[PDB]
Structure formats: structure tokens, C-alpha cells
């Protein structure tokens, strides 16, 4: 059972991550009611394109390692930067056993103002940036997200960074096969991460070029 | 390659990158991917540059010869059907991925011909490496009955996605407006990728490179 | 690779009312060298020079064809073929064998004798013409030559300047290529005169 | 590759040398198979491949050159000609149903003035030819395992100006180098030279 | 791809999704898979768009020639038997799964499944394409032959939706077309107003309880939705 | 690569080219191919540069450890045999290293070709790498056992040079060493294009 | 599933008499897209004086980067405080690439820095661990485009013209800017920015420089 | 194979076909695919019979040891998380598609799909095995959560039937089992009395008009059934 | 297969002969590599494979026999023994991670009475051994391309009773038949005989 496509984008004093609530066993859209965005401790979210199985094991192993280190020794919880470094090595270690975590994770989190957003690959390829996408998001949504960061070079507002996700999510929905029009949005701010109730997006299907008579082969 | 079409109220706007690659090299920075099919029909080409050029020419020719026989402007459906039947006969070995725009008597017509001979007559289309990135910008911003200005500025935007967010597409946006009356082919409508750092002229003075033998011949 | 077998590199370069086309001299089978006196340039007429690179068999076969076609032109048409035509004729000939191709990459220099405008064409093996203002290259040193030509080459250069950067290009690339070198034969075409130079390089 | 042909061209003769070794898998049948065919009075071709394509190609040439001498009232075609004919035939073959003639030729001859009016090359002509049809004029060439030992040994010693006598001494060293250094027992070499006078069979060297 | 003809008393209804995917990316969002052969004889097209389009045009041409020379209408049989021959001759080269449906005055509403092999099976209703496999059970349950023209359309839409909601390959618009004695009625249900979708169905509102907070109790509550909680 | 050593009365010449080409493109034109292990041992690297530079440097550790333990320099016999036993244990681990361990010890000069497959051969004359076939050509012409140190280096330098001239993978700089009872000395370090204008002045 | 993924990009180094310039592009490109335009992972500081540029798979460059730091950090403790020279780290790189030759790091490294004299030096590796000291060098997509240019403008091998005086820190930088600019324009997988590190006796001085965006 | 758990208010119903095929031959006609882990926690088993039986026994054993030492009932979660770990460790070696359903007093009626990969997805209802693919649409249409124990059983049977009637791999008996506060009620619906089958459905009585006599008229009548006619 | 070993056993000596040819691909390095190792005063083994496994197997045996002569206070083990030890080692190798020692041995010796009490075989012993560990006592054996030419030539001429002198004449014909008939230039042969007196190196034959 595979996850669709994640997108995430830094705004002023936070990160948005967004993901279809769908697992897909090959072509078949098996489950449309899956919460794919998980919270890692008090500061951070994670979410993965690819084998929900290998993500469910990695996100379990990490969320343990956090709430252990915190509860056992009288320490500050791990910063998102650290949690993500632990996730990155955990994944690299698994590709070095030829037993890979066969899933592209996006990862968001915010300690103070310190705002952190990163991807990681099956193989350990890790990259911070001001916008991430995995799966089709990378070929579709990233182009639009990068355009919305070029155009507001001081940084996006939370309303702007929500409208530009909603625009990408609409386009993922049109163009990615294994997607549905029911997304959640994680929002990392100072207070911590909040995952939205599932929402759909408005979709335009009644172009005059999409009518029957024009598209007819004969 | 990334090439794009949109239907606007008056006619069609095609778009193309210009970067013609050999493997992981830029052979030509400014190559023209929007070929003349007919006076009222342009035809952008992605895929094997040979096949795109040869198919395109063979048909532009066939059309021009047929445009004498009839004494009538070539219809876009005719051009489409010739690219189809030709590309289908070669089972997609002829790897030409065409966007065929034009405007006949019936009105604005914009199709894709995928290499196998598939045809999708649509209001906005993309083909080539950068297609997916372009089709994002196109799906977001496209609306019905755009003006020529909106429609160019969109197409340019959609190419610029493919140009930056894909390697094989690059350099500048060629844009072509086919309206009912005419065909405006604007080369470098947009130059996003100008010169970064001016050329440091290395000076090799005549008689530098050592020459064993020489033969001059006058005319 | 079948293209890299016989080795060779060719490069053309446009200046003001002149172009310099320049080959290497090597002929190989893979790594072993046969001859070091095999320039890859042919001269169609006064105003066209084309290098062929790739499988030497086909360089030689496809050359004899181009020679048969540009002679049959010169009799029927009663005039020297022009760059434009010649380059488009070559694409037609290469594409005629889309399936079962000639393993040859024709680089074509040309210059309209009236106007003085330069025309270059670097056709790939199935006749995909690439016709840039500046310069073109092909063969084994192609990656390395694009690197050289891009740095060294400026727009409106004079025959002597151009040759010295075309020669430095072809040489400084064939240093970094196994399958090219043993000098180079340049050929500096102007409206006025055609200067054929044999350049000394490495013996490697 | 088993059977080494050597050839080199000097002021006033081409010398050609070709393995005697006739092999069936790993079995020496004999060391006395002449692989240097004579196409003309003044032209011979050290062909080295498997016997089938070697014979069927050197016969096809030898016939279609004799056929030209008939139709051209005893006119002896230049070396450039037959070399370019041989290669045009070898090239035609890599794009037919048959496949390539799998034969590596060292075509050698001596263009003499054919009449009063001849202005063309007087003197000796050696051409190296791959099975594909890679024709190339050369001062000295080789085919077969031994080739690369001889090719370097000639680079060293071969000058363009040595006698008929210094050519026997050199061709002995070229032959003796294939004997010393190749496992495949190329133990007898048929050596034929082309001069102004015609083809002569050098028996001294082997 | 999801396609289906069904016959009602007078005639037939074809219905189709409008998505052609190159696997996982949606190349076209609004493809007409219903392809006119004659006035009243439409074929649906599953599998390689190229091959069905080339066959639809090749047959639509012969039916045109036929229709002219016989100086009468074409029997749907004729369309299906032409389409069988061309799907059969090339059965190795192509990947084409056709449904010829239509109306002629002699037999009324005829439907022929021509799947891959070039079989040709006159039926009450045919399912083609990737998203067929979902419908088979859905038909067996909810299909009830002797429907009105109105219901058969409203049904086929409902069906094509149930399929394209589970199939990845299928999705977008639900083009139908009713072919009977009267003039062909095409209608194109856009996704935003589709009769069924998993997104808007109240079954799947309440999320799976996967994430689940760090608790002192085996008692499953809901997902963890705030870092503060 | 081309790489040749040979034994004569005066001692052992080792000549090499100085190019490491990945088939078509040339990485480096300055690879030092004579590995200097002890001061009485010359390993030559040909084949997988990585495996040689590593193993011939290991050999170097084991030769030095022997000098410490046994209070006296290793033999070349034993030096080669160490390398041969390392390459044998790793024969089906896909090593690639045609090496030559040359040296002078108690029992005269000794040259040993050592393969990837654990092979170990007492050679009087030998050449490794793509252009070996070319070197051997020249080298079997001029080679006697009674050469002067001058003519031996002249012969080796030519031999490498004529491989550089023909082989595309062999080229660059024609380094020569001598191995004598007093250790080894680097004779020359001639560029192979200057060499062409010495050996063929016209 | 392939455990290797070429993450592209180009590194170059040029060693003068006082300094080394070390350049590595910031394009980290995955499979047919690009992940980042500001990836600094290419170059890595080991000591004040010694840097390790690294191409190919990022994930492996990043493992090796740590693995090398934790053998430098060990060397610091065992040899009482003293930092390892460039020449030491260089051989350590070769030794550590080889211990993993039966599942190689898919990473074409260059250890760059100053030797004990102050003369700048660079070493190059292949995945397996083949040390070659060079003076000017370039691994990656634009190896083939840059390395012939540098070959011409430094060695001046085929020029009658008298060799230029020496080449200062600022000229060698200006040469590399020009080279990379001509590699971004002609290679597809090179672009965005280039991080230059100018190691001298005084300390490193990094200045990022803009290329073509495509 | 067709398997499905559904939860009603109090507890769950598992249901299964009873056929294990070696492709096209039916090795066993009456397999119990519902496999007791504890008193109230059954797993369904799709895929290699060997691998699911070996895992069902290996888990049934740990749950037995667990249930003893904690001196209390097992949470269904515990059964599913044990089954996930074992399906995940070996995910490459085995071919196992499990559904752990059950009742514990804490959470009540829990259902976990553990498909191939070793995902583990707490759901209202899970479908497994070849014959799943048919049901997905059938559920989306006819399933309506908040069913009584009685209806959920009568439903699951109807479902397993619609699946096994279309799937070849699936067929035979429809074993169910209800796991709630009360004592487990297994029942085994034999095929001859199944709720749905294509054979007995009046939709499919009238044969396809394939054979069709030699006639002087394009008018399709029926099949040719006598040589005399 | 390149490098032919020949051996045959008569009334009062075993004769062994082994190719001198040391080859790198298709290149004759030399014709002077002794492949007949001496395991004892009275036992030798014509081993013919690639140099690596040939040396590392004939050394391993030669050491583990010397090690036995130490621990057995100068006692010279029978031929039957070392042969059976060699094969048990070769056989053990085809079911280890290493894989088969890829070496084809013609083990030969001369059992002398080791003390007063010895009742065992007095006289010469020849054993053919495959790389697999197929040990077999034989009158005459061979390995390599040349094998089957010699094997038949011995069938013809070899009698059990010929002199030391008729064994030189025969072993010359066996060596000369590999020279005439195999392409691979097995041009020099190391011939060693085992007698009551020990191993003697026959220089006459090659």
C-alpha cells in the first residue's frame, strides 16, 4: 500500500505540508481515509510518498527514539534538525543493508522561530529548502511553489502559502493518477504543528474545449 | 524540450524552449522548435529532433501541394490526420511528439500528436521533458476566452517552468500566435536566462599555434 | 560505441565573412591506431567544406555518396550547391536510413560567396540539423570541444584570430581524448581565399 | 586474429607477408596455405580471415577485375581503383542479408604508366582494409594477433628508402617477432613483393 | 480506462471516464472515449489510445462507404463484425478493448464487447478497460434489466463513477451517449457533480485511527492532530 | 597504460607511460605508475589503479615490518610472494592488478610479474597494460642481456614511447627507473611528444 | 530498486603556490527533476587547511564526510590535539574508500588544502580509492568542459607565446568563474550557483557566484 | 481468495470463500481461511496458504503466552501489531495478505488490514485476496455502516458471494464468524444455498445471441439449438 | 588446455614432459617455465593450469609432504599416498567457497623399498588427475590440447618394456606431434624421468 504525493512550503514563522489522504495498492485506490501526515514529538511533522509500510516502521522507530530520550534522561526534546538527522541516518542505514525504507519523506518542524523543512529519499539523499515536494508533487507542484517563492522573495504569508498549496493540490488532483480530492495540511508554527481536518478543493471541469463535440475523434 | 499550446478567444498561442541537446550537452541554445506547417497552422515538435523535423516538413509539403489542388486554406484537421496516419504507420519508432496549432474556418484548433499516433484535440496542451511542469502552470492559470496578451504571458510562464524545473528545456521562450488572419512568430518573447559574468576574452595572437605546412588558394 | 570505434573529431567556427573547419588526423580501431595522416575534411566546392566523424567505413561510404550527389547537382543544376541546400540534402540522405543509419556526424562549414554570411550545420546520424551562428563540433572530443569553443569564441573575428582559437580548441580537446589527436588539419575559408593548415600537436 | 598478415611500402617495392597456418579449431592442419592472392600482374591482397569468406571475396574481386580487363581491351586498372572497388564491395556487404565478408585485407600493388598519356601515381601503393570497409593508404600495415608487435617494430626500423635487400632483413625481423611473441604458431610466412617488374615470390624469408 | 454500454428497451447507453494516463501521470483529462462510427453506432475505446483511434477511423470509413453504396442504414452487427475482423487480424500488434454499441431499426439497441483477443459477444451490457473489473460485482448487484432510457443513463453515470473512484487509471468526466430512434443525446457529467465519489461519501469521512497519541491506556481514541495534544 | 620492466647485467629497467584513461576521455596525464615501496623494491601499477596503489602499499608495510622483525631486508622472491598470496586469497573478489615487483637483494636482480589471479612469474623481460603488445614489438628487437645502462634506458624509453605512439590508452610522460645493487634511481622523466622529435628529427 | 543514485554536479580545484581555489556547484538533481539549488554538501571542511569536494551520490558523500570527520576527530585525540595535514587526510581518504571497495561509496572525491611548506595541493579519488596528486582538476558532469579549458590556460602546451608570469589567487578565481559560466551554458546538469573556497595560510574565504538558472 | 472483516456496533464479522487453487485446479474445496488467534481474535488469510498458516500459528502461540502471563484478555491491536511485525520482517520471502479482526472489552470490534507490504491499517471494514478487487465497488455502493450483527453477517455472505461468483480463484463455502461480547458464532453457507450466484440470477438466464442460424435477414432472432432448424 | 603435459610409465622409469609455454592471453612471454615440480627425491607432478592455482596447489602439496617427512623422522611416503592426498585436496576444493584448484596433474613417482620390512609396490607409478579429483593409475596420460594427439600416438607405439633410450625416442615423437598438430606454440618441452636413482632432467629431448 503506497502513499501519493506530499508538498510543503515555508511561510513567515512556519511551514505548511499537505498530502492526499489516500493509500493505493498499485492502481487501486484502496483507502481514502488515511491520515498520512504524522506528528514526531512536540515540534515536528513527517510525511511520506511510497510504501506506507516502510514509513509506518520508520515513523514508529523515530517517534519512540524521541519520547524515550525525553522521558528517560531529563533533557530538552530533540530539535526538528536533530529528529530529521536521526530519520536521515535511520534511512541511509537501511539502504546500506539492502533493506531500504523505500519511501521519500518530507519533514517539517519549528522549535522557536527556527523553521525547518527537509526531504529525504529511499537512499538517504537529504535536502533542506524553502519548498519541498515528493512523488508527482516534484514534477507538478514544485514548479508552482518555487514560482510563488521567487515572486514573494521576502517570504510568503500564511494566507498566500495556503492559496499556493490549494493551487498545487488542485493540479496534483487533475494530473496525478493515484490522488483524491481530500487533503490534510500540517501547519508548523511557534506553538507547534496542527493538522487540518480533511478538505477538498474547488475543481473546474466545464471548459468549452472539454465538451463532447470538440474532443470527438470523429 | 517543453512545448505548449493554449486556445484563446481569437486563435491559438504556441510556445517552445530553444535548447537542442545531444545527450548531456547544449548543441544549440537558440534552435526554433515552432515549425511552419501552413499559413494558418504552426507545429511545435518535441522528441527525436530529426523525426519532428522530417514528419513536420513531409506534411507541411503535402499540405502546400493540396492547398494548390483545392485553392483553399489548409484545415488543421487535415494536417492532424496526416501526422496521425504517418506516425501510426511507424508504431512510434518515428518518435515525433507534436503540438499542432492553427486556425481554419471552423475556428481555433489545437491538438497533440503523441509519437504512437494518439490525438487529443484540447484547449491547452504540452509535450516534451518539461511538459509536466508546464501543464501545472497551464492547469492553474488557464481560463476560457483569454486575450492574446493573457495567453502569451501564460504560455511564456508555462515554458519558463519547463525551462528552469527541467534540464532538456532551456534558454528562451519562442511564442507563436496563430489568429484567424495571420501568424506572429515572436522569437525570444522572453529571455529569462541572460548572460551571468561577461566573456573574459583570452587573447591568442596570430602565429601562436605552430603550423608544420600551409597551402593558400586564391579565387 | 560504434561511433567512437574509428575515432576522430571535427569542429567548424564562424567569424566575419570567414569560417574555420578543423579535424583531427587520427584513424583508429578502438584504442589501437592505424594511421596519423587521416584528416576528415572533404571540399564540395570553393564555398563548402564538410567534416565527417564516426565509423570510418561510413565516413568513406557516405562521403562517396555526397561526392556522387554534389557532382550530379553541379551537372543538372549548372551551378555550385550552396551551404543551405547541401546541409539539407545531407539530412535527407541520413534520414533516408532512419532505420539502419549511417554512423556519421557531418559537420558542415559554408559561406555565401556574394553576401559573405557564414552557415554551419552539425547533423546527428539521422539528419537532425543544428545550425548555430557561432561554431559546431562532433566526434569523440565533442564534449571537450564545446568546453573549449564556448570560452575562446567571440562573435566578429577575422580569419587569423579565428584559426588560432579553432586550432587551440581542437588541440587542447584532443589532449583529453584517447580517440583523437596526432595534430589536426584546419581549413580557413574566406570569400577571397581558402587557407589549408596542418597543425602540429601531440603524438598520443 | 590467428593468422598474421604484414606489409610495408618503400621507394620502389611493396613487401607483403601472410601466415601459412591453416587451422581447424586448435589443430594445425598445415603451415603451407598461401593467403596472398594475385589480382593482377602488379597487384596482390594479403587476405586473413576464415577460409570461406577469404576465398569467396578474393575470388569475387579477382574475377570482377579480370572481367574489367576483358571489357577494357587489356587495360590494367590502377591500385587506387581496385582498393576502392574492394572496399565498396566490403562496405556493401555490412548492409546486406549475407552480413560482412569477415576478412582483413592488406591490398598492395605497383602502378606503372599504362600508356604514354598516364600522369597518375607511378610507384608502389599499400592499403589497409578492415572487414567493414575502412580503406586507408599506409606505409605499413598488419592484421592478426601479431599485428601490434610488428606495427611497433616497423615504427622503429622501417624507413621509406630501404633496398629490396634491407626489406628481406626487415621482413625477417617482422616474421621472427610474430614467431617469438604470439602463442598461435605462425611458424611459416609466404612473403611476396610487388616491384615495377611484377610480383616475385621471396623464398629467402619465411 | 472505464467504459460500458447497457441496452434499455428502445436503444443503448455508452458511458466512459475521460482520463488517458501514461501509467501514473494524466496526459489528457477530457478524452472522448465514445467514438462515432455512424450517426447511431458509437464504439467505446479501452487500451492504447493510438490503436483504438486508428481502428475507429478505419471502421468509421468502411461503414461510411457501405452506408453510401447500400443506400440504407448500417446494422450494428455490421459495425461489430468489421471491428472484430480488424481487432482480430492485428490481435498481437495492438492492445485494443472495444465496445461497439448502437441502434439500427431492424434489431434496435445492440451492444458488442470486442475484448483484446478479437472475440465478439452480443450482450445486454458490456464493461471494458482497467476500471471494468470494479463494476462486474456492482452490476451483478444493482443492475436490473428493463430500465427506462433516463434510469440507464443515471445508472451508467453512477457505475462509471463507482469504477473511476477506485481505479487510478480511470477518472475525470463521465461522458454518456444514448442511441435510439430519436437524435443522439450526449451529456458530460463533470467530476465536481459526479453521482458518487469516495471523498464526499459519509462512510469515509471519519479517518482511520493510525497515528494515535502516546497514551497510558490501550483505549484507542482518535489520531493525534495537535503537537500541544 | 603501458608498463615494461626487463633484466640485464647492469640490473633492472622499469619504464612506464603516465596516462590513466577511462576508455574515451583522459582523466589524468601525470599518474606516477612506478610505485616506490622500499628503496630496493619497485612495484609497477597497471589494471585497477586503486587495487595496485593499495596492495603495493600494503606489500610496503609488510616489507618494512620484515626489516624491523628479522633485522635485514626482505628478498624480492618473498616480496612478490606476499603480493601473490594477497591476490590469490582475493582471486574471486574481482581484483584487477597486473603488477611487476622488481628489486635487487642478496641473490642478484629479480623481476616478478604478479597477476590479480595470484599468478607469480620470474620474468627476464615483461610488459603490462593495453600498449604492452606495442612495447614488446620494439623491445624484443633491441633487447640483449649485455646492454649498457645507457642503451637499456634508451631501449625501454623507445619501447614505452612506441606504445604511447600507437595505443590511445597509453600516453603522456615516459618515466624510466633503474634498479642496481645500491637501490633504485629514477633515470629520466621525458614527455613522449618531445621524444618523437628526438627519435624522428625530420 | 538501485542503491546508487547519481545526484550530479561538478567540483573543480586549482592549486597556486600560496593557496587552493576549490569550487563545487550547488545543484543537487535527483531523477529527472532537481531537489535543491542551494545544496552546500558538495564541499566539506575536515580541518582549517583541508577540504573534501565530493561528486556523485549525495547520501554517500554525506556518510563519507562524517566517517572522515570521525577519523580526523580520532587523529586529533591520539596525536595530542595536533590536526592532520592535507597529505595525511589524503591517504586516509584512499584507505577508507578502499575498505568499502566491495560495496563502494559512489562518490568521486578531491581532498584539497595546504602541505607543510604552505604550497597548495589537491588529490583526486575514484569510488574504489585511487589517489593521484594533481595541480588543476575537475570531476563531474562538466569535467569534460572545464578540464580542457584549464589545460589550455594554465599549461599553455600548444602555444609559441611565452608562459604567463605565475597566476595569482584572483586570476585563478577569475579563470574558474569564466570556465563554470561556459559549463553551465553548455552542460544541462551544471547550473544555479557555485560555492568557491579560497584556502590560503590566512584562513578560508568562501564567495558563492551565480550561474545560468537552467 | 476472498476475505473480509466488517465491524458492527458490538464487534466484527469475518467472512471468507473456502477455495485454495493451485491456479486453475481447486486443491481444497473447504479450507477454513478464518484462523483463531485467541478466543475472540480471528485472522483471515489471503495468499500462500503455507505462509499465512505458519504466521497464524506463530502469532496464535505468542498471544497464548502473552494472554497467560498478563493474566487478562489480549487487545486486538496486540494481535495486529504482532502480525504486522512478522508480515513485515519477511515481506520479501512470503506472499501473505492478512486481516486481523476481533473483540477486546476495551475498544470493542477492531479490524486491521495487513496487506503484503506489512502496512497495518485500522478500519471499519477490510477486503483481502484476489476476489477483494470485485467487492470495493460493491461496498462503496451497498455498505452502510451502523448495521446490526444479523445484517452484517447476511451482508458479508452476500459480498463474499458477489466476489466468488466473478473471481475464479475464489469459490465454494462462505464461512463467516461473529466476534463480540457473546460466544463466537461461526456459520458455513454452502454454495448450493449462497445468497447470490450468476447461475441462478435471472439477468443471465437468456443466452448471448452468438451462434445464430443461417438466415435471409439481418434480424437477430436467437441461437441455433436444433440441426433440423 | 594451451600447455600440454605428457607422461608414460615403463618397466623401470616414469617419463614426464610439460610445455615451456608461459602465456599472457595470446602473447608468448617465454618457452622456459618448468611446470614439472619435484615433491620428493622420487616423486614429481606435471601440473598444467593457470600459474596461480598451479603454484598454490603444487606448493601446498610439496610443503604438506615435507611437513610429513619431518613429523615421520625422514620416512619417504609412497606414491599411492601422495596421489591420494593430492586428489583428496583437489576434491575438498570443488565443495569449498574458494572453488576448484583449476589444475590438471600427471603425478609420477618411483616407490623404492623404504626399509627391510617394506612388501609394497617396488617400481614406477603414474597417476592421471583431473582438477575435480578424478585420480586414476595409468600406463600413460596427457593434459592440454596436445593430449589427444599424444594419447593415440602412445596407444600405437608405447609398450610396457622399452628402455630409458627408447623412452627418449618415443617422448621426442610425443613432443614433436604436439609441435606439428597444435596451433598453440608448445615449442619447448621440459622432460624429467623418475628412476630407482631419483629424478634426472632429460636435456636431450625438448
Residue numbers in the entry:
A (entry chain b): 2 to 219
B (entry chain I): 30 to 248
C (entry chain J): 2 to 205
D (entry chain K), I (entry chain Y): 1 to 206
E (entry chain H), H (entry chain V): 55 to 283
F (entry chain Z): 100 to 301
G (entry chain a): 126 to 339
Article sentences:
Target deconvolution and cryo-EM studies reveal that compound 8 is a potent and selective inhibitor of the chymotrypsin-like activity of the parasite proteasome binding in a site sandwiched between the β4 and β5 subunits. The potency of 8 against the nonpathogenic Leishmania spp. Leishmania tarentolae (EC50 value of 40 nM) was comparable with that achieved against L. donovani promastigotes (EC50 value of 14 nM). In addition, inhibition of the chymotrypsin-like activities catalyzed by L. donovani and L. tarentolae proteasomes by a set of compound 8 analogs correlated extremely well. These data suggest that inhibitor pharmacology against L. tarentolae is broadly similar to that seen for L. donovani, providing confidence in the use of this nonpathogenic surrogate for subsequent structural studies. Apo (3.3 Å) and 8-liganded (2.8 Å) L. tarentolae 20S proteasome structures were obtained using single-particle cryo-EM.
High-resolution cryo-EM structures of apo and 8-bound L. tarentolae 20S proteasome have revealed a previously undiscovered binding site for inhibitors of the chymotrypsin-like activity. This site lies between the β4 and β5 subunits and exploits an induced cavity that is lined on one side by β4 residues that are divergent between human and kinetoplastid protozoan. The structural basis of the resistance mutations identified in our studies [G197S (β5), G197C (β5), and T30A (β4)] can be rationalized based on the distinct inhibitor site that we have uncovered. In contrast, T30A (β4) has no direct interactions with the ligand. It lies at a pivot point between the β4 and β5 subunits, allowing the β loop, which contains I29 (β4), F24 (β4), and Y25 (β4), to wedge open to create the pyrrolidine pocket. Comparison of the apo and liganded structures obtained by cryo-EM suggests that a T30A mutation would alter the ease of this motion, changing the access to this slim pocket, which is important for activity and selectivity. To investigate the selectivity of 8 against the human 20S proteasome and rationalize the role of the single-point mutations causing resistance, a homology model of the L. donovani 20S proteasome β4 and β5 subunits was generated using the L. tarentolae 20S proteasome cryo-EM structure as a template.
